[PDB]
Curated annotation (Swiss-Prot):
It is an enzyme of class 2 (transferase). Changing D180R: Almost complete loss of SAM binding. No effect on growth and ribosome biogenesis. The record marks D59 as: Stabilizes Arg-88. The gene is EMG1. Gene3D superfamilies: 3.40.1280.10. This is Ribosomal RNA small subunit methyltransferase NEP1. GO terms for cellular component: 90S preribosome; cytoplasm; nuclear microtubule; nuclear periphery; nucleolus; nucleoplasm; nucleus; small-subunit processome.
Amino acid sequence: LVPQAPPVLTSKDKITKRMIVVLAMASLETHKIYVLLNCDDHQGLLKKMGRDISEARPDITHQCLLTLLDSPINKAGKLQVYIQTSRGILIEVNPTVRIPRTFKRFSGLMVQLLHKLSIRSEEKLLKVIKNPITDHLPTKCRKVTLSFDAPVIRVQDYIEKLDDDESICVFVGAMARGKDNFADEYVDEKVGLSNYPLSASVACSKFCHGAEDAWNI
């Protein structure tokens, strides 16, 4: 007894109250040898490039996207996802896009996106857009960064404290390790979800679950 075709939310809608997740510091870099650089397949190459092999982690972004887009909140049309790469590329993800389950085809899709600047259905399902993210977010929107070092909140508590017209944008480090400062230019609060450090995919899942509770999804 719920709407079977909810409105597809984009950055063009500045009003509708929604949850936004920004996958920040995403490790999405192309190389012709085209593939996404990753720590499992390109250890030798990354070493010769003088890179920290452990930083090449596109799999984290892949798993976060699957968790987020599979969620009840996404199907209910109350979720948006953006990607901010470690190299400053900003990507808007259409809620209806199908993300491949295998890493190989995910990499193939990301390579095409980063080279062509969009992925077409003629509507765009993935699009490279202009920084800063704040130019695209809903007019009334809370902005928070998830951090292990921050005080722990219950997601439902936090979501229920939003005004009826106020969206929430959550910045999540799409990384295994790193400092929580990636979105200090945009946010005015940092919060924790657990007394344990969480994988990015798990943090995404917990936040989706808590919003689903609060919004009766």
